[PDB]
Structure formats: structure tokens, C-alpha cells
């Protein structure tokens, strides 16, 4: 199996590309994992960057969808009201449409849709968690920024965004970050997907202060405190923080790691309940 492009997946308000990896042996009613590239990258680039994901698809029979952004220096829109809001439009709605296309065409399991991404893609994974909790069951954000930090910014790239968020200059209370999540879908009554975040202490692109802000955000959303910590988990220097009963939010801080934390497929697939 290799990566191939979907020319028409339906309405595409973000004007994005869609690339798909379908293993030769699919599960019955396969899961779908959306895998999101970083700024200046591409769908084909992220497919080759996270080399462990496609073999994991082969072994477990789930589908990988790689959306691609060709706007704003190949960055995901995490700034406009449209992209930040449930059913708003722009990139987030295009990605959801890619998901709906995949579930319909490949008889996928709509209760097993997940997303993971790095930097800009991690930022979008948290947008998808807050704005589309009715679509995604779990997200894994590697080296990103809390949901809503860039709201109202004139762009989402190193050359167009307000740089306060990437510089780690934005700090808000857990309650304020929870309020941000609720603004993604005002009046939403339901639950949110499992959230797993990662960051490196040496990240010179996206400040590790953003890790603290993401922790405040999702601990508040789920109403949980740290209950367990694992050192050198899953790798030396990685500190794993487990919240509440462990079913909704966990966080990893990697000592000495920069931009970005390499995807840990076992940790992320187990979080999604797929292995
Ligand atoms: C959202 O605004 C930003 C996104 C990224 C993303 C980087 C990446 O995806 O690799 C970097 C920024 O400044 C360095 C920045 O201000
Ligand atoms: C949430 O519940 C209220 C009633 O309590 C209802 O008016 C509203 O439509 C619900 N929200 C959604 C997104 O269905
Ligand atoms: C979280 O910690 C705060 C501060 O100690 C406490 O007030 C709150 O009750 C805790 N929440 C729990 C244990 O669910």
C-alpha cells in the first residue's frame, strides 16, 4: 500500500488537499486517523516524516487520512472564527468532510475517528477536539498551542500570526482556557474526546510554556487534577502526567527535546484504544 490523493471528497471550504493511506488488509469497519502536517510541510511530507504510522495501519487495519494545507505558508488555520467554530468553515470543516468521505466510502467506524499532528497540526488537532467533539474520539497533539490562543490573529504561520502564542507570552487561567473550548461550540452539551499532549523543554519554535497552558486547558475541561506521574515514560526524559482516572487527559513533557516531539505511535495508538 502507498499514499494516494482524493481529488473530490465534497465541500472543501479550506481549499485543502486530501491524501489517504489504506492498508491492503482493512479491519471490518476500520478506524480513521487524521494525521496533520506542520507549517511549511505537506501531506506527502508528513506521511514520510512519521514513518511508524503507515506500518501501524498495516498491522491494525485502520485508515490514515493526511490533509494538506496550501494556504498561509502551508499552515493550518487556527485563527479565523470559521475554522475555530463548530460548522464554521475553513480548514477544520474541510478536514471533517474528509473524515465523512472516508467513513462513507470505506465503511469506516464513525466511533473510531482520531487525529494527531505536529506543531501547526497539533494546534489543529486541538481545534478539532474543541469544535468537533461529535466527530473525533481522541486526539494526540505533538508540540502545539492551547485551543483558541490564536483567535483573532491575522494569520497562523511564523510569518503572519501574532507571535505571542508561539513565543509563550500568552498565559490564561484554567477556567479561561476552558471558556475558550466552550466557545468552539456554544451550547454544546456533550463530552469531549480523549486528549493527549506532548512537548519538549528545548522547543525554540513553539515555547514549552504552551504545554503548561494546554495542561490548564484540558484539566479544566474534564475537571481533573494530576493523580499519577511516570518518569522516563515512554522514553528517558519523558515525564507522563496522568489526570483523574486516566480516561480523558494525559500529558508528556520531554526533557531536552526541541521542535518537535517525535510521534510515539504505541503511546498514541494505545490512547486511542486501537492496540
Ligand atoms: C500559529 O502561529 C505559529 C505557528 C508556527 C508553526 C510552526 C510549525 O508548524 O512547525 C510557528 C510560529 O512561530 C514560530 C507561529 O507563530
Ligand atoms: C443543549 O441543550 C439545550 C437544552 O438544554 C438545547 O437547547 C440545545 O440545542 C442543546 N445543544 C445542542 C448542540 O444540541
Ligand atoms: C483539584 O485540586 C484543587 C486544589 O487542591 C481542589 O480544590 C480540587 O477539589 C481538586 N479536584 C479534584 C480532586 O477533582
Describe the model:
The protein has 275 residues and is α/β, with parallel strands linked by helices. The protein has a single domain, classed as Rossmann fold (3-Layer(aba) Sandwich), CATH 3.40.50.1820. A ten-stranded mixed beta sheet has the order 1-2-4-3-5-6-7-10-9-8, sandwiched between helices. Helix 6 packs across helix 7. The longest helix is centred in the middle third of the chain and has 17 residues. The radius of gyration is 17 Å and the shape is globular. The chain starts with a strand and ends with a helix. The site of sinapinate (SXX) has 12 residues, from loops. It is classed as hydrolase. Keywords: Feruloyl esterase, complex, sinapic acid, hydrolase.
For the sheet with most strands, the description reads: 10 strands, mixed
Any guess at the CATH architecture? 3-Layer(aba) Sandwich
Catalogue the ligands.
sinapinate, 2-acetamido-2-deoxy-beta-D-glucopyranose
CA radius of gyration is 17 Å
Q: Report the sheet-strand fraction.
A: 15-25%
Outline type: globular
What's the CATH first level?
A: Alpha Beta
* Structural class assignment: alpha/beta
Number of domains: 1
PDB class: hydrolase
Keywords: complex, sinapic acid
Assembly: monomeric
Entry title: Structure insight into substrate recognition and catalysis by feruloyl esterase from Aspergillus sydowii
